[PDB]
């Protein structure tokens, strides 16, 4: 690009609101085919996709989300829906624009764009102004030297497609890998009762009403919104070491494991972390430790490969928020195998594991560092 | 607090167990009662009597009714009433507030003790109920000055639906302050409650004592609290008045007076039809504003009322809704007349929530008639410790801070500065555009983060190996 | 305070982008439908859940867009009423074009 | 229908777990609460939202493990609902143990 | 209810058959780190 | 029981009674009073009962 101008927003584009909908369907399970596409997570179950006065969202226009953000992007990917608040983005003139450059250009100013405080909308404010523009090598060569920087673009927003993909795919054959291996096990190894392999210990709950029990302190805290992890050696919430004279807990040794028992299961999967920092938990979930027949990352793999049917085992309880017993998850019988199939396997799972688990040995270093350079790689790339 | 704590319990217990809304006024006229038994008992004292008697002068009932205005008798106070311990029947009350307002000559504030209520399902109950709500306000711990202090949580006890929180109404009395030592203050369209009226002046009365609190407000049991709540703190009697009824529909006084400041607090859907319905085109105050208010955002008309009755000498200082880009094309170019001359001062956002459920944060207008003019909005939202305001409720000097920015213009980094004239005329007027000072701003490095995922990706390469050899157990 | 409590401001404040602003157009007057439905809904937590026990409106979204998708429960209401008076308010565009711009002929 | 209103059905449904069930242990009455308080909640639409419209009970959490990080608004109250509950049958439990338990000698 | 319960929208995966499916879309990632590398020097 | 409705004839053979808050099945207990040799009874209920 040798003639670099900045040029207005809506000079060369066409804004418009959606058109008329009436898509309150009862039911819209995954048997229907149309890409619902939202703010957040793009993606909401499927809708039949014809006669219903849909957009079609034809070859490349480009979208805002929402009223009170106007900073969610998304490319139209290649015929989807018009989901009742997609107010959309295109231009008149299409021998210069090319708009996923413009999708690739809008999301390089992070300014304004990232103070969503107040409640107001934004139409007029991006509609006006700027934009870079090679300019005036129209229309001789505008786009033919946006051509190698789209290329950079395109293949950048191709690597970060097909790792989300490969971790897709590396996670589900890992899911399943898991268990033909160490599964089955023949024959015969011991089928020993979960409690059988070691103490384990309730949890417990302090009141929040004492501020001296609660303001400071160096015992971690150990909750299901800190869960979800996988390996957690801290969590947000840090407990007095006064308030273990009145929290009903017990102090857990460091090496330890944990397993929630309220409300993440019964709709979807239980998570479960190595625990590496003696610390305390709450009521409504449960620390376990075992004892020296074993080693710990066996217990560890195990209730992470056989969740999905111990969640099975004891599922309802009752239509209720709380959930699965105590007495049906101590009653489980798990094989535990002589020494020599503990270390050699599960140095297997966890060499394998500890490629995929966020964050340190993982794959989101790579994942989101890319990410950041090639924002970054945006920003340099586009000056003057 | 010191002795918030205690009275707040026993006070607190009385709360239970129905809906407090009908019981408050029998809490209130008990509270109010006692208060007038010890207020004419300081008269009177000042050693003589523990109780009283019946006496009929007519002479020096006649005295406190021009100075005080308030003779029911010597022996109809609540000190007086403890011996009659579940007095059959309940609405002698209803009596013992009668002619203590009979009070024609001169200078009522009555028509004004309505509060104590019949209901009640009989007249037992009543009995009962009154029995032991007066053993729980006796039952408080007296103390004397601070007697009404605890009031102020008896007007707040359902803010934890509009009266104040007590930071905003510091911030405005340190807004309307100072440098004004002038006839006079204060004036109060909206008025609510007296609670954001008290502060200022209550504080500062030994600045000085100029004339009357002018206020009005719509509502008939907080038109009640509202003037007994100046009354209960100790202020004087004179001026001190709240007129009834709508401020846009019945202002007064008219001539009276471009002022020196003037409070007020405005709620949302407060509305009105426009533009107009009445008779307020061809008003006296409306004729400056050109286009006239809309139905729904009735703020505005209050702000229009304020230009009215402020002299360049004095200034304002009133509080508005951030929810505003233009307010339709009735209210864009009320928003430039405002802009038109130096009218508006400065502009005072704050912070979320530190409110009673509102959750957003608050506009302050601060105005006057005079000429710099650079519309500076010094606006903030952090901090504005706006999580709780308890530290230190009586002086907290985080005003402080914002006197310190009113001082001298501060341009702070991530903090509001001194704004141009013509910077807001290339915006549509809004607040605020200007600043809003640029937190977060986060970008990277070329080669940090490559070398990184470089060893990362070798990481995967052995984790790869060994993943192709143990496929085999 | 009803749903309808709320549609009646929202339906003044309609009335008022149509009335005052004079604008003729199907899109820029649902952009006035963006600016003051929007600016209607109430702020007080009761009286937004006294809407939300009120009839009309119920708890579901069709666009999960408008969900921040977080702790900000309140929003999530906000937006229900907003979409549920969106609606509403596209009915009542397309009565209030061809009633209103009829009736300013003079 | 108040927040007392639900309080008054946890408060004598765990009046009966710790009566009729004879239980004198802290953690096992801790877990009758579980029992009870959950099973107090309301279920209508309009009578959960009048809870919330009252007072004592609040919007936010301590605790965000009680969300369902979905659509899921009807549980975000009631696990609300829950916690204020749970709260406020600590205190009763650790009341009512030394009250009932003291009583029941005979 | 616990019993019956009768196994329905229960579902399980295939060992091996992504894994090398994965193999592959490693093997596009070794010029994807490559078309990153090369590119990273403008 | 305060009342005499442990004694009643509807209640003969079954258990012990129905508490306050989870009155549901006193309902049907009194159901199958109420019923011949020959037809059935169709009554509704919460679903969350693991034991009550």
Redesign the interface.
């Known amino acids: 690009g040798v003639e670099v101008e900045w040029l207005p927003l809506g000079e060369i584009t066409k804004y418009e609101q959606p058109t008329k909908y009436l898509v309150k369907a009862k039911d819209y399970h995954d048997t229907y085919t149309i890409p619902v596409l939202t703010a957040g997570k793009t993606f909401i179950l499927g809708y039949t996709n014809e006669t219903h006065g849909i957009y079609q969202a034809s070859k490349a226009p480009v979208i805002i989300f929402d009223d009170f953000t106007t900073a969610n992007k998304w490319v139209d990917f290649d015929f989807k829906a018009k989901s009742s608040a997609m107010k959309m983005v295109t231009s008149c003139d299409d021998n210069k624009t090319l708009l996923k450059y413009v999708y690739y250009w809008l999301n390089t100013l992070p300014s304004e764009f990232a103070e969503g405080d107040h409640k107001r909308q934004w139409i007029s404010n991006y509609s006006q102004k700027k934009i870079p523009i090679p300019c005036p090598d129209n229309p001789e060569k505008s786009l033919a030297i946006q051509s190698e920087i789209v290329r950079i673009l395109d293949k950048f927003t191709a690597l970060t497609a097909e790792l989300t993909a490969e971790l897709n795919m590396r996670k589900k054959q890992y899911n399943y890998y898991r268990d033909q291996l160490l599964s089955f096990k023949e024959g015969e190894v011991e089928w020993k009762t979960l409690g059988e392999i070691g103490k384990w210990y309730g949890g417990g709950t302090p009141s929040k009403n004492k501020i001296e029990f609660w303001e400071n302190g160096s015992i971690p805290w150990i909750s299901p919104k800190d869960m979800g992890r996988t390996l957690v050696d801290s969590s947000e919430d840090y407990i007095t070491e006064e308030a273990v004279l009145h929290s009903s807990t017990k102090l857990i040794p460091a090496n330890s494991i944990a397993i929630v028992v309220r409300s993440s299961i019964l709709d979807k999967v239980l998570p479960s972390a190595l625990i590496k920092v003696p610390a305390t938990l709450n009521q409504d979930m449960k620390a376990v430790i075992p004892h020296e027949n074993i080693l710990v990352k066996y217990i560890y793999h195990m209730i992470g490969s056989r969740g999905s049917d111990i969640l099975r085992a004891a599922k309802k309880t009752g239509g209720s928020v709380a959930s699965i017993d105590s007495k049906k998850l101590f009653s489980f019988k798990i094989p535990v195998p002589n020494i020599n199939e503990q270390q050699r396997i599960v140095e297997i799972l966890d060499k394998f594991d500890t490629l995929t688990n966020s964050i340190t040995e993982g794959l989101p270093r790579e994942i989101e560092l890319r990410q950041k350079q090639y924002e970054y790689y945006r920003d340099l790339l586009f000056s003057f | 607090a010191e002795l918030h704590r205690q009275i707040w319990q026993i006070a607190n217990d009385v709360r239970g167990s129905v809906d407090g809304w009908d019981f408050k006024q029998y809490v209130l006229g008990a509270l109010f009662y006692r208060f007038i038994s010890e207020n004419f008992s300081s008269y009177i004292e000042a050693t003589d009597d523990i109780k009283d008697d019946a006496i009929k002068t007519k002479g020096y009932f006649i005295y406190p009714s021009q100075l005080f205005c308030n003779v029911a008798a010597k022996a109809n106070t609540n000190d007086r009433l403890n011996a009659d311990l579940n007095s059959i029947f309940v609405a002698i009350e209803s009596s013992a507030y009668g002619y203590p307002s009979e009070a024609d000559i001169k200078g009522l504030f009555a028509d004004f003790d309505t509060t104590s209520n019949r209901l009640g399902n009989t007249v037992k109950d009543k009995n009962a109920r009154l029995a032991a709500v007066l053993k729980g306000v006796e039952g408080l711990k007296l103390g004397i000055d601070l007697f009404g202090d605890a009031y102020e949580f008896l007007i707040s006890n359902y803010a934890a639906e509009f009266f104040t929180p007590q930071h905003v109404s510091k911030l405005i009395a340190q807004l309307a302050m100072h440098g004004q030592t002038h006839v006079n203050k204060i004036y109060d369209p909206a008025a609510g409650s007296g609670s954001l009226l008290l502060q200022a002046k209550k504080q500062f009365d030994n600045h000085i004592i100029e004339e009357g609190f002018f206020g009005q407000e719509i509502n008939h049991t907080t038109y009640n609290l509202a003037r007994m709540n100046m009354f209960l703190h100790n202020i004087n009697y004179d001026k001190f008045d709240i007129k009834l009824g709508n401020t846009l529909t019945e202002p007064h006084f008219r001539d009276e007076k471009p002022f020196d400041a003037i409070v007020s607090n405005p709620p949302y859907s407060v509305k009105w039809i426009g533009s107009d319905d009445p008779t307020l085109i061809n008003d006296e105050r409306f004729a400056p504003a050109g286009v006239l208010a809309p139905k729904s955002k009735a703020d505005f008309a209050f702000v229009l009322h304020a230009l009215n009755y402020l002299s360049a000498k004095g200034r304002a200082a009133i509080v508005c809704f951030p929810g505003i880009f233009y307010r339709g094309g009735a209210e864009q170019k009320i928003r430039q007349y405002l802009v038109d001359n130096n009218y508006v001062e400065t502009v005072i956002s704050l912070a979320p929530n530190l409110f009673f459920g509102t959750t957003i944060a608050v506009n302050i207008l601060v105005l006057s008639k005079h000429k710099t003019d650079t519309n500076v909005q010094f606006i903030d939202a952090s901090e504005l410790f706006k999580k709780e305001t308890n530290n230190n409720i009586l002086t907290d000097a985080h005003i402080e801070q914002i006197m310190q920015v009113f001082a001298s213009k501060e341009d702070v980094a991530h903090l509001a500065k001194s704004v141009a004239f013509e910077t807001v005329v290339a915006n549509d007027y809004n607040l605020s555009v200007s600043s809003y000072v640029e937190a977060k701003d986060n970008r990277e490095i070329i080669d940090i983060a490559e070398l990184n995922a470089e060893l990362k990706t070798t990481v995967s390469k052995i984790d790869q190996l060994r993943k192709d050899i143990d496929a085999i157990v | 305070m009803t749903y309808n409590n709320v549609f009646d ?1 929202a339906y ?2 309609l009335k ?2 149509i009335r ?2 004079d604008i003729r157009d199907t ?1 820029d007057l ?2 006035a439908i ?2 003051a439905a ?3 809904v ?5 009286d937004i ?2 809407v ?3 009839e009309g409106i119920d ?11 977080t ?1 900000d ?2 929003r ?2 906000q937006a229900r009423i ?1 979409e549920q008076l969106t609606i509403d308010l ?1 009915e009542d565009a397309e009565d209030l074009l061809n009633e209103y711009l009829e009736e300013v002929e003079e």
């Open positions: 401001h003044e404040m008022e982008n005052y602003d899109d649902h952009d963006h600016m929007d600016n209607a109430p702020h007080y937590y009761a859940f006294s939300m026990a009120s708890l579901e979204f069709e666009d999960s867009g408008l969900m921040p998708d702790k429960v309140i999530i209401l907003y596209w």
